[PDB]
């Protein structure tokens, strides 16, 4: 159940889970999520901008409660301190990289804890 660094997940096919529904942006207490979306070249409802200000985030885990597709998660990583402030303003590429790096552990934790949810 630990809430550490955030990540954006994918389906086993590699497709992004996020459908740009902005429920996480709505529920975020700290207004730390910024989302902008448009139809993709194949007509999918997908995000073009997904930002999380990790200096504004209060690590409350409401975004992964409010996500209907398990896209945004708060992963197990907690050792991600940086040397400049700007490095803590994640964007979609950074969050997808986090998801790709931590997917195994994220999947294992969600499998372990999804029956309590």
């Amino acid at each position: 159940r630990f809430r550490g660094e955030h990540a954006l997940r994918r389906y086993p096919s590699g497709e992004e889970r996020c459908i740009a529904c902005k429920l996480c942006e709505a529920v975020c207490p700290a207004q730390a999520i910024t989302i902008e979306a448009e139809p993709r070249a194949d007509g999918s409802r997908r995000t073009t901008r997904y930002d999380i200000d990790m200096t504004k985030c209060i690590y409350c885990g409401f975004c992964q409660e409010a996500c209907p597709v398990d896209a945004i998660v708060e992963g197990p990583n907690f050792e991600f301190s940086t040397e400049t402030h700007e490095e803590l303003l994640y964007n979609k590429e950074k969050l997808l990289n986090n998801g790709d790096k931590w997917e195994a552990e994220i999947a294992a934790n969600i499998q372990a804890d999804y029956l309590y949810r």
Partner: protein, 689 residues
Amino acid sequence: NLIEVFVDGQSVMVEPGTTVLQACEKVGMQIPRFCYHERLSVAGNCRMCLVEIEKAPKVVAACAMPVMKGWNILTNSEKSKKAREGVMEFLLANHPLDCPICDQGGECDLQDQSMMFGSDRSRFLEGKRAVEDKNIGPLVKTIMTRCIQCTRCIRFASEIAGVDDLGTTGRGNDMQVGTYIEKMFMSELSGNIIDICPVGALTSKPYAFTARPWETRKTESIDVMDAVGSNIVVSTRTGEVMRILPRMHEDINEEWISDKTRFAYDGLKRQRLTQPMIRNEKGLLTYTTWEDALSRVAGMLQSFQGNDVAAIAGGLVDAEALVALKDLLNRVDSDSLCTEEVFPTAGAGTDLRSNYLLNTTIAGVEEADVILLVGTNPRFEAPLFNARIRKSWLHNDLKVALIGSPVDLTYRYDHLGDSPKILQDIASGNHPFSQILKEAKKPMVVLGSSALQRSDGTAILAAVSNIAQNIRLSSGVTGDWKVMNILHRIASQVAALDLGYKPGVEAIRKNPPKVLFLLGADGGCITRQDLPKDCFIIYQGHHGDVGAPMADVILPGAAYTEKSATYVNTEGRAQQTKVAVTPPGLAREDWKIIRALSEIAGMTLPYDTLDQVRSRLEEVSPNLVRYDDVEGANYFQQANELSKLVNQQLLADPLVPPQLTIKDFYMTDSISRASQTMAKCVKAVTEGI
């Protein structure tokens, strides 16, 4: 007389024929509903408005049940609550789990009324129904698995838009809404099915997936694509225009807007003028500074004077900019102030407003008995005016007759010829329609402003004034009913004519100017072949279409979504658009640009703020600062007496409107031409499919 009914024991005095839903509305209770719209007919098929009467063992449909004397309506009773819960259970039983991927999102009536009047749990343990998605054009996106079969789109299409291309095919649970064939539902009032559809079955295709309702900020402005002046709400998000929605005004707009109004906001993001531009030694337009551009313009303005200075106003200009430019040109004794839209100056001219206004207001069509349209296609010139005419036609058996080209209006009309010779005949009394007008209790004559663009606009105006005079003499002299009307198609026309601009560009043609201020003038009426050699041209505007390519100096301005501005619609009502976003780049407000130019040139204008500019507008014409007022004086007698003096011969040409088809509707002004959605609409209506 009024009868007495009771809502939850509280007495209400209601006219006979009032329904249970309307009585509850009168005491302030809004009964839940899906299929009921107050602008459409009564269907009574969703069964969501069922309420209990005090002694009735059976629930009644509140939307279709007239109240009887001494009825007690139990709006919060156990029977009503259980009825609502059951109906909502059926609806959500077959609905799909598409809320996160649904544009209806936080503005869905199924969601809100499920949270308010439904159960919080589901008993449906079966499979759901999946419905094939139809295709009805590039504007409306159909995801018909979310349809709740309320038949609002069918009723709206038929009754309001006069298009019977929507219906229900099949029966039972497998009943579907659509066309049954691959036909596009293209009409000037097509987005209103997006508005009235309670669910996400019909959604805007340009707006698809871009935003959510809670994010958007709402700015209440007015529409500038035509001269109806429809009230709209601009939905913005982080300083960006996201959507245009209708705003209710039962005397103008009446909850609907046209497709050009709704879907041409995409043109505000393309071909935009963002920085001042001058011409280098090679003659190519290059970016510069405000100070540099204004210094060049002021140098020329100080160099010349007299009728060597002209200004041409376009169709999207506001009263503040118009009066600022008028003052600036009057400071140099110049007067070649004109609009790119012709009105007959022979006779009364623009001296009396009840000579170019729509004297019988938009809401006044609902009282007329006979209406005669002259040389116009109101379906494309003013879609809400034509919607009002169709509504009056349907609900009052109004007789509509059209002189001229047989366009396809959404209602049956009596066609009269194609030539102004019929107009001559009716005034004489030979035509049978003369007898019809004479015996009509409330006649109306509407002359389209496009017909005045002909070489014989004065003759047509004199003929229709003669017809109105004949109506007035034979019928009742007394009364506040007004017969003579003129329907405009340009947003800035009435404001310019009030301020004192000379209609048409005949003055510029007669005396070619050394300096020409094109204020939003993208109509191409005057070009450099008309102008003298080495003429200096200043184009002030927000889109680069025509004047910007031909200009020597380019000054970026603001759009109606970006400035707080005053526009006068075709019936003489004044309205103000509020600021939604700010002008892009270095673009400024138009009156501020003119004021800065005057200050640089040394003839500083006596206003520095918007309130002071509005005060100057009040000095020139107070009706421009009286906003919601539409009441004005009638000077038809003087106008007719002055028109009788000078008469010319009507041209022997048929009265053909500029717009005969919906593509001609789609491509009208600078913003519409810059829009890509309007290009898609033109492609769809031209090449089909």
